[PDB]
């Protein structure tokens, strides 16, 4: 996020010194990149005690929320985002068959 600004700036300088007839090459405001809400990604009953076919419905609801970005009650989207590989954390106490 912060590291990209460097890359962008060096690349802008090349077009600037190359072409002077066209001046003031546009840039976006800093908050376009700083703001995290703009980008797509950003009372809990104990599931262990539940019946099976209700765990299935709950997990489906959380996954349907997961698909569009942010995570859900029983499954979390890990905030590491190291390198470029996103990872997710399912609740530990589930049925192994559902979990895989």
């Amino acid at each position: 996020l912060q590291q990209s600004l460097e890359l962008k700036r060096k690349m802008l300088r090349d077009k600037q010194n190359k072409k002077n007839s066209g001046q003031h090459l546009p840039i976006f405001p800093a908050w376009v990149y700083e703001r995290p809400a703009l980008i797509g990604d950003f009372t809990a009953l104990p599931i262990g005690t539940l019946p099976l076919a209700s765990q299935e419905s709950a997990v489906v609801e959380d996954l349907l929320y997961v698909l569009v970005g942010v995570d859900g009650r029983y499954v979390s989207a890990q905030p590491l985002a190291g390198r470029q590989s996103r990872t997710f954390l399912v609740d530990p106490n589930l049925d192994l068959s559902i979990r895989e």
């Binding site: 049925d95 192994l96 068959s97 979990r99 895989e100």
Partner: peptide, 29 residues
């Protein structure tokens, strides 16, 4: 009742298993 598992054993599940392993030594169902 147990048959529900078997229905999903047709697909990959954990109730029954496909341990990616040597047949019948660690490979199991």
């Amino acid at each position: 009742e147990l048959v529900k598992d078997v229905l999903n054993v047709l697909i990959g599940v954990v109730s029954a298993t496909f341990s990616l392993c040597q047949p019948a030594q660690a490979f199991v169902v």
